């Protein structure tokens, strides 16, 4: 995706599917 990297996600945000929310989209899943 475009506003965020994925090393950006992963580091904080848990799991695989809320990590995706952020990959695709940038936002973290509940």
Request: charged share 25%; with cysteine; proline share 3%.
């Amino acid at each position: 995706g475009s506003g965020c990297m994925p090393e950006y996600c992963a580091g904080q945000c848990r799991g695989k599917v809320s990590q995706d929310y952020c990959l695709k989209n940038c936002r973290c899943i509940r």
